[PDB]
Every structure is written in C-alpha cells, then in structure tokens.
Design an enzyme around this catalytic site. Structure first.
Site, PDB file in Angstrom:
ATOM      1  N   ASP B  27       0.833  -1.166   0.000  1.00 51.07           N
ATOM      2  CA  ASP B  27       0.000   0.000   0.000  1.00 51.07           C
ATOM      3  C   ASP B  27       0.896   1.254   0.000  1.00 51.07           C
ATOM      4  O   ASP B  27       1.130   1.820  -1.062  1.00 51.07           O
ATOM      5  CB  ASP B  27      -1.047  -0.167   1.121  1.00 51.07           C
ATOM      6  N   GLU B  50       3.788  -9.290   9.984  1.00 48.86           N
ATOM      7  CA  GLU B  50       4.158  -8.108  10.743  1.00 48.86           C
ATOM      8  C   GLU B  50       4.384  -8.462  12.227  1.00 48.86           C
ATOM      9  O   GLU B  50       5.240  -7.870  12.887  1.00 48.86           O
ATOM     10  CB  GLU B  50       3.085  -7.033  10.596  1.00 48.86           C
ATOM     11  N   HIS B 105      -9.279   3.067   2.612  1.00 44.80           N
ATOM     12  CA  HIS B 105      -9.100   1.601   2.512  1.00 44.80           C
ATOM     13  C   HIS B 105      -8.008   1.212   3.516  1.00 44.80           C
ATOM     14  O   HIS B 105      -7.004   1.899   3.607  1.00 44.80           O
ATOM     15  CB  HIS B 105      -8.730   1.218   1.070  1.00 44.80           C
ATOM     16  N   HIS B 106      -8.213   0.118   4.265  1.00 48.40           N
ATOM     17  CA  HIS B 106      -7.525  -0.114   5.537  1.00 48.40           C
ATOM     18  C   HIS B 106      -7.986   0.968   6.518  1.00 48.40           C
ATOM     19  O   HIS B 106      -7.263   1.346   7.402  1.00 48.40           O
ATOM     20  CB  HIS B 106      -5.992  -0.082   5.416  1.00 48.40           C
ATOM     21  N   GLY B 392       6.251 -11.696  28.337  1.00 46.84           N
ATOM     22  CA  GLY B 392       5.914 -13.124  28.306  1.00 46.84           C
ATOM     23  C   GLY B 392       4.917 -13.475  27.228  1.00 46.84           C
ATOM     24  O   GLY B 392       3.878 -14.149  27.491  1.00 46.84           O
ATOM     25  N   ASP B 423       7.056 -26.654  21.668  1.00 48.97           N
ATOM     26  CA  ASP B 423       6.128 -27.033  20.592  1.00 48.97           C
ATOM     27  C   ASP B 423       4.940 -26.069  20.503  1.00 48.97           C
ATOM     28  O   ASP B 423       4.491 -25.697  19.414  1.00 48.97           O
ATOM     29  CB  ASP B 423       5.588 -28.453  20.762  1.00 48.97           C
ATOM     30  N   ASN B 450       6.661 -31.727  24.267  1.00 48.64           N
ATOM     31  CA  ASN B 450       5.996 -32.305  25.393  1.00 48.64           C
ATOM     32  C   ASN B 450       4.475 -32.393  25.125  1.00 48.64           C
ATOM     33  O   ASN B 450       3.720 -32.584  26.015  1.00 48.64           O
ATOM     34  CB  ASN B 450       6.381 -31.586  26.697  1.00 48.64           C
ATOM     35  N   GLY B 452       1.974 -30.331  24.057  1.00 51.17           N
ATOM     36  CA  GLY B 452       1.055 -29.270  24.400  1.00 51.17           C
ATOM     37  C   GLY B 452       1.679 -28.201  25.269  1.00 51.17           C
ATOM     38  O   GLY B 452       2.875 -28.042  25.345  1.00 51.17           O
ATOM     39  N   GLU B 456       1.067 -24.445  31.242  1.00 53.69           N
ATOM     40  CA  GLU B 456      -0.364 -24.294  31.545  1.00 53.69           C
ATOM     41  C   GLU B 456      -0.903 -25.561  32.232  1.00 53.69           C
ATOM     42  O   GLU B 456      -1.578 -25.451  33.224  1.00 53.69           O
ATOM     43  CB  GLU B 456      -1.171 -23.965  30.288  1.00 53.69           C
TER      44      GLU B 456
HETATM   45  C1  LIG Z   1      -1.260  -7.444   6.895  1.00 49.95           C
HETATM   46  C2  LIG Z   1      -1.011  -6.829   5.532  1.00 49.95           C
HETATM   47  N1  LIG Z   1       0.289  -6.616   5.151  1.00 49.95           N
HETATM   48  C3  LIG Z   1       0.604  -6.147   3.922  1.00 49.95           C
HETATM   49  C4  LIG Z   1      -0.418  -5.822   3.002  1.00 49.95           C
HETATM   50  C5  LIG Z   1      -0.114  -5.251   1.633  1.00 49.95           C
HETATM   51  N2  LIG Z   1      -0.361  -6.230   0.547  1.00 49.95           N
HETATM   52  C6  LIG Z   1      -1.459  -6.187  -0.245  1.00 49.95           C
HETATM   53  S1  LIG Z   1      -1.579  -7.432  -1.445  1.00 49.95           S
HETATM   54  C7  LIG Z   1      -0.063  -8.014  -0.926  1.00 49.95           C
HETATM   55  C8  LIG Z   1       0.509  -9.177  -1.678  1.00 49.95           C
HETATM   56  C9  LIG Z   1      -0.414 -10.358  -1.777  1.00 49.95           C
HETATM   57  O1  LIG Z   1       0.360 -11.398  -2.327  1.00 49.95           O
HETATM   58  P1  LIG Z   1      -0.283 -12.783  -2.786  1.00 49.95           P
HETATM   59  O2  LIG Z   1      -1.218 -13.141  -1.615  1.00 49.95           O
HETATM   60  O3  LIG Z   1       0.845 -13.739  -3.072  1.00 49.95           O
HETATM   61  O4  LIG Z   1      -1.307 -12.405  -3.996  1.00 49.95           O
HETATM   62  P2  LIG Z   1      -1.075 -12.362  -5.602  1.00 49.95           P
HETATM   63  O5  LIG Z   1      -1.381 -10.934  -5.967  1.00 49.95           O
HETATM   64  O6  LIG Z   1       0.380 -12.821  -5.814  1.00 49.95           O
HETATM   65  O7  LIG Z   1      -1.979 -13.440  -6.154  1.00 49.95           O
HETATM   66  C10 LIG Z   1       0.468  -7.240   0.173  1.00 49.95           C
HETATM   67  C11 LIG Z   1       1.822  -7.605   0.690  1.00 49.95           C
HETATM   68  C12 LIG Z   1      -1.814  -6.040   3.465  1.00 49.95           C
HETATM   69  N3  LIG Z   1      -2.832  -5.742   2.653  1.00 49.95           N
HETATM   70  N4  LIG Z   1      -2.052  -6.542   4.699  1.00 49.95           N
HETATM   71  C1  LIG Z   2       0.744 -14.494  22.938  1.00 49.58           C
HETATM   72  C2  LIG Z   2       0.433 -15.331  24.135  1.00 49.58           C
HETATM   73  N1  LIG Z   2      -0.576 -16.242  24.085  1.00 49.58           N
HETATM   74  C3  LIG Z   2      -0.867 -16.998  25.137  1.00 49.58           C
HETATM   75  C4  LIG Z   2      -0.131 -16.885  26.306  1.00 49.58           C
HETATM   76  C5  LIG Z   2      -0.407 -17.796  27.501  1.00 49.58           C
HETATM   77  N2  LIG Z   2       0.653 -18.845  27.601  1.00 49.58           N
HETATM   78  C6  LIG Z   2       1.766 -18.769  28.360  1.00 49.58           C
HETATM   79  S1  LIG Z   2       2.832 -20.173  28.317  1.00 49.58           S
HETATM   80  C7  LIG Z   2       1.734 -20.930  27.199  1.00 49.58           C
HETATM   81  C8  LIG Z   2       2.001 -22.354  26.686  1.00 49.58           C
HETATM   82  C9  LIG Z   2       3.436 -22.663  26.387  1.00 49.58           C
HETATM   83  O1  LIG Z   2       3.515 -23.976  25.827  1.00 49.58           O
HETATM   84  P1  LIG Z   2       4.832 -24.423  25.095  1.00 49.58           P
HETATM   85  O2  LIG Z   2       5.421 -23.348  24.225  1.00 49.58           O
HETATM   86  O3  LIG Z   2       4.605 -25.723  24.327  1.00 49.58           O
HETATM   87  O4  LIG Z   2       5.782 -24.592  26.400  1.00 49.58           O
HETATM   88  P2  LIG Z   2       5.883 -25.791  27.476  1.00 49.58           P
HETATM   89  O5  LIG Z   2       5.389 -25.254  28.760  1.00 49.58           O
HETATM   90  O6  LIG Z   2       5.046 -26.931  26.894  1.00 49.58           O
HETATM   91  O7  LIG Z   2       7.408 -26.060  27.548  1.00 49.58           O
HETATM   92  C10 LIG Z   2       0.609 -20.060  26.938  1.00 49.58           C
HETATM   93  C11 LIG Z   2      -0.494 -20.505  26.058  1.00 49.58           C
HETATM   94  C12 LIG Z   2       0.951 -15.878  26.329  1.00 49.58           C
HETATM   95  N3  LIG Z   2       1.725 -15.648  27.393  1.00 49.58           N
HETATM   96  N4  LIG Z   2       1.182 -15.172  25.234  1.00 49.58           N
HETATM   97 MG   LIG Z   3       5.003 -27.613  24.923  1.00 44.08          MG
END
Ligand SMILES: Cc1ncc(C[n+]2csc(CCOP(=O)(O)OP(=O)(O)O)c2C)c(N)n1
Ligand SMILES: Cc1ncc(C[n+]2csc(CCOP(=O)(O)OP(=O)(O)O)c2C)c(N)n1
Ligand SMILES: [Mg+2]
Ligand SMILES: [Mg+2]
Lengths: 532, 536
Positions: B27, B50, B105-106, B392, B423, B450, B452, B456
């Site tokens: 854009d 992003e 737009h956006h 965190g 994981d 592990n 999951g 948690e």
């Molecule tokens: C979150 C976000 N980041 C960036 C954009 C800008 N943007 C619009 S279309 C596009 C490319 C889309 O590429 P693709 O999905 O491969 O479609 P194509 O035109 O190749 O079929 C981007 C990066 C957006 N609209 N939203």
């Molecule tokens: C963005 C985000 N989503 C959810 C949470 C809540 N949260 C903290 S630890 C965790 C799970 C971590 O699991 P994993 O990465 O597999 O680590 P493990 O404890 O299994 O080693 C979640 C869901 C958070 N802190 N941040």
């Molecule tokens: Mg895990």
C-alpha cells in the site's frame, strides 16, 4: 439453582447460535474456558495464534451471525487487534472477551486501545451486574454487527449466578423507526422512483448479514430494475436472476456494466457503505442524511408502495457475460483470466467462496456464482492472511449449519505465509475446505503497482504440497495443477466435488499473470499523472 | 546534491549500525522501500508477517542497540502492536516506521485516519507524524535518538507523498547525538554519598543484576563493581548473561521463591541489595536504573546509572574496605552419568545444555518450561541471554531468533544463536523460520516436544483441551519452508542428546538446524514441579 458466570456467558452465546469459541488460553482465562465444556454443543477451536483466531471469529460471524473470541490480558488481546479492527471496518459482530487480572502501571491501557475499534466495551467488576453486562455486550455485538470488548476478571468467572437468568432471552430486536422520519424517507424515495426512467439497484455487502438479502430480491422482483453487486456484496443477489447485471467495481467493471450503471438516472443503493442509500443505521437521499431510519423497516415499508411508484417503468436489458470459456488444448498453461471463468463450472448452490486480497480478489468478480453462494472478500480492510483464519471460522459455522456446504478458499502464495498455521486447526477438527493456493512466485498484485522486480515482492518458496502432512493431517489431498487439462481433470472429477477431506490445490501461474481488468487498470495507472 | 527523504532515513539507520530492516511491504511503504537497495550494507528481511517482524526487530535491537521495522497503514501496524508493546515493556529500542497515505481503505469506515497513530501512542516513548519536508530530517533524527537512548519503541509515520521529496545529502554529515546528558551534579553526589554510606554499614551486601544490565551498556560497570567490592553477585532471569558466570562471586539466579534454597537464602538474608538495571527482604534497596536511581523510597530522577555507577566505582572499594567475602552458592555443573537409553527429562537437559554452550553464544528461551529451565543452566562467559520474562508473549522467540541471527551475522558470523522453544509457542510464529532459511541464517532451533502447553497444564487443567495442540511434524518444517541446506533430528534419550551435541559437525553454525527434543507432557524443571504439587 446456581451456575458460574463463566457458564452463564457460554449458555448465552449458545442461545445466539454461537457454538465455537475462538482464541488461545492464558493465565487469566483458563478458569473461564473450563465452562465451555459444561454447555452441550459448544467447543474451543484451539487456535494456532490470536490474530488467526480473530480472523476465524470474523469468518464464523459472517456465516453464523455473531462470534466469540477469548484471549488473555495483554499478550493475547494485542495479538488479535488487526483481526478485531477488520471486523469493525467491515461490520462483523465479534465479541472479544479478555480474561483479565483480579480486581509502568495502567492495567487499562489495552482496554483503551481496543475501545478505538469496538462498538462498546465493558470491564465487569461486579458479580451482580455481570449478567446484564454480558447480555448488553452480546445484544450490541449482534444488533450493531461490530466488535465488542468484554473484560472478565479471573476471580468473578467461577462466582455463581441464578441459572433462571438464562430464561429471559436476550432482546436482539431493532427498536423501530420514528414513523414521521420514516414516512419522510419513503415519501421522498417514492417520488424519485416516480420521476426516474432508468434506475438501478446496487447491493452492497450488508445485504447478507442484516437479512435485507430477502428485502433486496423483493425490491428487484417488484421493480424489475436491473440489479448489481459491489465486490463486497457479491453473493447478496443470486446471479441466475434475469435482472442481475453483474459486479459494479467502478472504473474496473466490465464495459457493459461500467456504463450500464453510469447511464442510470437513479441509483438505489442497498447495504451501501440522484442517489438513495439504505444503510443499517440510517438512510441518505441525494445530499440529505436521515439518521435513525434503519434499512430493515424503511425497506419493508418501501416494498409495499414501490410497484405503484414504478408503474410505467419499462425493464431495461442487462449485461450478459461469457458464461463459459472456449475449449483449448489440455497442455495449455493456466492463466488467471481462464481460471476465474472456469471456477464458475465448479461452484454449486450453498458454497462459501472466500478470496484473499490480491489477484484472487479481483479474479472472483469475473466468476459466475450459482444461487445461494456466500461470498467472503475483505475488500475494505484488505488484510492479507485474513482468509486463512476466515476459512477455519467459516468451515466451523458451515459445519453447524449444513455439512453438505463446501468452503472454497482462493489465497495467494504470499498471503498464505502470514496465517499458514491456521491450517493446523482445520486439520485438528477434521474440517474439509478446498484450499486453492495461487502460486505465482510472490506478491503479483504489488508487482502490478510498483517494483515488478523488487526484492520486497519476492517471497521464500514453500512446498505447498507438504503443508498438510507437516501440520499432522492423516487424511488429505494435496495436488498441483499447471494446465487446462490438469484443472479440468481434477475439478470435473466427481470424487473431488465432494467435501470429503481437506484439500490443497496448488495453482501454478505466471508471476505477472492477473485478471484482465486488474491488468488494464495498471496499464492505465502506470501511463497517467494521477497519483497519491 | 540531494537525496530522497527515504534514502535519508536508511542512511541515518546505517550510521547507527542498523543494517537489516524488518517489516512487510504494502500500500503506502513501496517507494520508501526501494531506497533500501540504494544504500550499501542494508537489506530488507522480507518477514512472513508483521507480528513476527516486530519480535524480530526486538531480537535484532537487543544485540545491535536498536532496530527498525517498517509496516503499512492499518493492516500492517496493528499486526505488529503486540511485539511493539513487548519492546515497550522490556525496554527494547524499536523504531516503528509506518508508511501512511498522502496528507480510503484499511480504514475503519469512520473518519479517524489518526486512529492507529493514537493506539500506538500508548506503547511508544514518543511519536512523530511527519508532514513538513523542512522538519522531516530533524524529526527522523529525534525519533532515532529517542529510540536508541530511551531504549523504547518510537512511532514514525511517513506519508507516501513525502518519501521521494529531496533533502540535502550534507544533513547526514551531522551525526545524530546518541550521548546521555551528564547527570545533575548535586543529585549525583547525594546519590553517591548515600550508596557509599549504606555500603559502609552493610554486613551482608549483595549485587543484583537485572534486565537493563547489558542493554543499557552497564555490563562492564557491574563487573567492575563485583571486582572492586567482592560482594556476592546474582542475576534475575531477565538479567541472566549480565554477569559472566565463571566469576567466583557469581552465586546464581534469584528467581524469588523458585530459586535454589541457597540462592533464596543468600539473597533474602542480605541487609543491602545493590540492584542494577531494574525495570521495577528489608528496606535497604538501591536501584540503578537507566533514567533514575532509587535508594529505599527516595527517588533521584535524571541520575543515570551509566555515569552514576562510574562515579560509585571511584569510591566503592574504600566503602567496602571492611567487607569479609561470604562464600557463594553454586549448582553442581554436571549430571551424574546414566545409561544412554535414559529418556530425556527437563532437569537433566537444562544442566546438560551447560556442556554445549560456549563463549559468544546468544541463548534465547521461550515463555513456558524453557524460560524456567534455562535458569539452572550454567552459562559460559560472554553469553547473551534473551528471555522475555516480563511481557511473556509466547511465539516471540521465533521472530527474536531471526532478528538476533541477522544481528549476530553482522557482529560475528562464528557466533551461535540458540533457541529453546516449546512445541506450543512455535505454532504462533512458525513461519518466520522461512525468513531464516531465505537469508541462509544458521540458528539452532531446539523444539521441546511435550505434547502441548506444559506450563499451563501445571497451573490449571492438566488434561484440559485448551492445553492440547495439534501435533506437527517438526522435522519437515525446514524442507516445507524450502530449506535446501539444513539438519533436523529428534532426541528422546541422553545418549542421543550426547551423540548430537558432542558431534564436531553440530557444534559450528554451518547451517540451520531443528532439534526435536522429546519430553514427557507433565515433565518440567524441579522448581516448577515443586509448586504445582505444593500450590495445587
Ligand atoms: C497485513 C497486511 N500486510 C501487507 C499488506 C499489503 N499487501 C497487499 S496485497 C499483498 C501481496 C499479496 O500477495 P499474494 O497473496 O501472493 O497475492 P497475488 O497478488 O500474488 O496473487 C500485500 C503484501 C496487506 N494488505 N495486509
Ligand atoms: C501471545 C500469548 N498467548 C498466550 C499466552 C499464555 N501462555 C503462556 S505459556 C503458554 C504455553 C506454552 O507452551 P509451550 O510453548 O509448548 O511450552 P511448554 O510449557 O510446553 O514447555 C501459553 C499458552 C501468552 N503468554 N502469550
Ligand atoms: Mg510444549
Ligand atoms: Mg502471490
């Protein structure tokens, strides 16, 4: 008889046909999420991240009417904001429930940030008002069809309320129109139809979801005025109707259409977002706004007098389009302009068709839909990656409405990368969408605007075929197609036409290939001194 | 002789050792973006989303001092905001540039085109929306300095119609001033006199190195204070790596009530805590912060740690004159040998990692069991830890790893970037592995399988559905994202772990690698397990 406030929220959502709950667990919502499994017919999608969970929420709500996503304080809720914001932009009712802590400092900062993209917000503090607060949030989500932010402290969730509170329904009814203001609109609108000799109807996206899809077809049936859809409103009008004229994209409408509209002496704009616009919350006639006069009732009253006022009008003919391609050789390389016409051959009644921002978005405006086809294309907000999540949501909701119903995504290879992991939770739930990935080796729509060869329009090349198995699918289909014959052989295969497993179809296309009216578009924008 | 405003920006970032630009195109940032290729020694990462770009900017800035992420109006910047907020919480210096429309737009359908600017304002040190070519250069410079010196995100909005207007190239010949204003003399002297007084009267002083030790350029000062006082020196989980753990006075990690008993006792028994680079028992706490120092309840605002420590160091030995060094705690640094068939357990593994690490290693650990386990690993000297304990945000480390790897590449290619991720966490941001592959970056990706969300499971709903995840084929991630030159292996046993981690080929970052570390679902470091069982 006593239930948790948790259970009360899910029982409430169940009563508004919300069966699937999106989001991710964290510290401040775990207690709340337990309650889901105390309400029969409810489930936790278990999303692969919060952005994706909100896109899914959006998708779900588009089909089901509203949705719910639950996240955790700070880390969860902030991840979802781009999803929420798109729902706000496009008028999708998504309830965002944030589990928050017990009741730089400023624990309110995230609540304020979401206020910006929410119809209303509540921070529940009081076990006694909480039921009415939940109820008000749900109503507002549903009726306003915009996101609502509900903060739920972790210490109130397992506090109990009377179960018989659930015995008063939530009021999902609109408050009626001021008759005098409404009579004014109807009066004026009817005058305009009496004069005009060549009106058109334009359906925008709001038809489907605000249920004026039914009012819209009746207006058509009673006027025989030719009827078009915007990209967002595509599906709002069943396209086998004699008076369907096609998709109005402005400058980019196929020529017949372009002028067909432009040649009209009165426009009746429905679900919009010498002209009359019917919006959900108001209507506008020429320059004059009329706040409060809601399209549902306004349009109802209009239908009872529209024949009278249109007495004399002679039905104008309407744009036909090349329903079918020509036969060509089986070895012919796939081109975008062939593919979107051919996609017509494959659609059926009841399909949900989702198209990502990119070529796909432009592409699908050239496809003929059968009747009862539910379009999803995020043309206003335009966030790539949306459609992956939206596909999951839509596939859940379509599961709960009718198993027959097919979910068909068209997503660019670019867009897929942003939100690819949500394929995982499609698989975990045994959902069966058709994932058409347009492999054109990068961001082709941008290659079409600026930097054909720029590195930022290049992407890392993935093995699409291995996505499904990598994410743990044991029953799937992944296939690549590069030719006419490959496309035909796959898509006219009756086996393939049955939403019997999750499928990924990798569609091999030139890098600079595109729908013809996106092509010309930039043939026009790159030769002009019109600029931003 | 003129350059575009866009070029000016990238030239300014090159001057402050920012070589890799994060974000995604769209854009309204396209012609800004072209300018990158016009500056030698710059690159556009090409992130897969992003959010991940922001986390990457965070990782990059943690190594290189500061970073830059570029997003597009609306869709781009709102996607980044959770990363931006973590950077604001953990005091990491990310300059967020948003390509915005010229001054439909956006858009939220409403009128407010500033709405996203306002949302970002809550998690920014400062903002600028640039509208005037004349002040555009100075605004950019102010944004860069602010990011670098306050070490917090800055928002910089760049209208599309200004990025290709020209400015004098000669503007670049004036360096951006990145020095701190000297302390207030009166204030700094009251601070010093007091700290010195407390140190005289302390029987059991201790030094605590928190998060801002490295990032605000205080590792050397902190080390000189240990050296000149001989007080016991402990790190916080966030601070870990702040003090080189081979120092004899290094007593370990204070994880509060999850410490080792010796560490817990060694710290809580102190009559004076010298805390360094806090971001905020007994009363006698001195906090040395970037921006201020605090002595008990008393705050001295604008008395900065850099200079204030430097002054402290010139008198501290006199004050500590009559100190008698206490012997410090230490964790046994080696596992007792076991049969090569012994299946992997967390307690064994966090000590074993110890045998693998070497000087110059960047160690990244994800929120979950890893963040807690890493605290029992003995580090080699000059080991830089990243563990986002305060904010965190799981998934963070996938982006942060990319970012760290870019920065590491630019500082020293021999330098290893090592990630422990669950994981679970891996799913939120798995795709940024693509961006590593693209640039031939060679981190070690330890994935703890592990089955999951174990951390948690330990706190609530042991077998609840929401703690379960879809099981992926971690060994196929790399080839699925197009990796041609890589390694991917599973380890279920001690012998297997030993075989891999002692292998000649494994021990240099000659390629990107995924190690799938198979662990039982309810297995965790003993601290955590003596918590679930204790506070059931
Ligand atoms: C979150 C976000 N980041 C960036 C954009 C800008 N943007 C619009 S279309 C596009 C490319 C889309 O590429 P693709 O999905 O491969 O479609 P194509 O035109 O190749 O079929 C981007 C990066 C957006 N609209 N939203
Ligand atoms: C963005 C985000 N989503 C959810 C949470 C809540 N949260 C903290 S630890 C965790 C799970 C971590 O699991 P994993 O990465 O597999 O680590 P493990 O404890 O299994 O080693 C979640 C869901 C958070 N802190 N941040
Ligand atoms: Mg895990
Ligand atoms: Mg593409």
């Amino acid at each position: 008889s006593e239930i948790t406030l948790g259970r009360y929220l899910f029982e409430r959502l169940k009563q508004v046909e919300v069966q699937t709950i999106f989001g991710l667990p964290g510290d401040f919502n775990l207690s709340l999420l337990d309650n889901i499994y105390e309400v029969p017919g409810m489930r936790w999608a278990g999303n692969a991240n919060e952005l994706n969970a909100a896109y899914a929420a959006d998708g779900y709500a588009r089909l089901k009417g509203m949705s719910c996503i639950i996240t955790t304080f700070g880390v969860g809720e902030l991840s979802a904001l781009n999803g929420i914001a798109g729902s706000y932009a496009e008028h999708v009712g998504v309830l965002h429930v944030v589990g928050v802590p017990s009741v730089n400092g400023d624990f309110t900062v995230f609540h304020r940030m979401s206020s910006n993209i929410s119809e209303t917000t509540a921070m529940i503090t009081d076990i006694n008002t909480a039921p009415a607060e939940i109820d008000r949030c749900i109503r507002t989500t549903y009726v306003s069809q915009r996101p609502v932010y509900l903060g739920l402290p972790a210490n109130l969730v397992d506090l109990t309320v009377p179960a018989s509170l659930l015995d008063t329904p939530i009021d999902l009814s609109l408050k009626p129109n001021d008759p005098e203001a409404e009579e004014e609109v109807i009066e004026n609108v009817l005058q305009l139809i009496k004069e005009a000799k060549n009106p058109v109807i334009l359906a925008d996206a709001c038809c489907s979801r605000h249920d004026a899809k039914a009012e819209t077809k009746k207006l058509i049936d009673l006027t025989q005025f030719p009827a078009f859809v915007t990209p967002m409103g595509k599906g709002s009008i069943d396209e086998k109707h004699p008076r369907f004229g096609g998709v109005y994209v402005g400058t980019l409408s196929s020529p017949a259409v372009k002028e067909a509209v432009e040649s009209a002496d009165l426009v009746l704009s429905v679900g919009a977002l010498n002209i009359v616009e019917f919006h959900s919350d108001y209507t506008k006639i020429r320059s004059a706004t009329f706040p409060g006069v809601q399209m549902k009732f306004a349009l109802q009253k209009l239908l009872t007098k529209v024949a009278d006022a249109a007495k004399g009008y002679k039905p104008v003919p309407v744009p036909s389009e090349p329903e079918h391609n020509e036969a060509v050789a089986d070895s012919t390389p796939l081109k975008q302009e062939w593919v979107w016409t051919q996609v017509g051959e494959f659609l059926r009644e009841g399909d949900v068709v989702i198209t990502e921002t990119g070529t796909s978005a432009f592409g699908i405006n050239q496809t003929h839909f059968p009747n009862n086809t539910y379009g999803i294309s995020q043309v206003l907000w335009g966030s790539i990656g949306f459609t992956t999540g939206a596909t999951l949501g839509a596939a859940f909701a379509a599961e709960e409405i009718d198993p027959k119903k097919r979910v068909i995504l068209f997503i660019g290879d670019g867009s897929l990368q942003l939100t690819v992991q949500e394929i995982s939770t499609m698989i975990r739930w045994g959902l069966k969408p058709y994932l058409f990935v347009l492999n054109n080796d990068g961001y082709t729509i941008e290659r079409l605007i600026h930097g054909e060869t720029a590195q930022y329009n290049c992407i890392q090349n993935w093995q699409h075929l291995e996505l499904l198995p990598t994410f743990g699918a044991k029953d799937y289909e992944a296939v690549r197609v590069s030719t006419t014959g490959e496309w035909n052989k796959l898509t006219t295969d009756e086996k393939f036409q049955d939403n019997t497993r999750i499928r990924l179809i990798e569609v091999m296309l030139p890098t600079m290939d595109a729908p013809s009216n996106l092509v010309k578009q930039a043939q026009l924008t790159a030769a002009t001194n019109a600029k931003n």
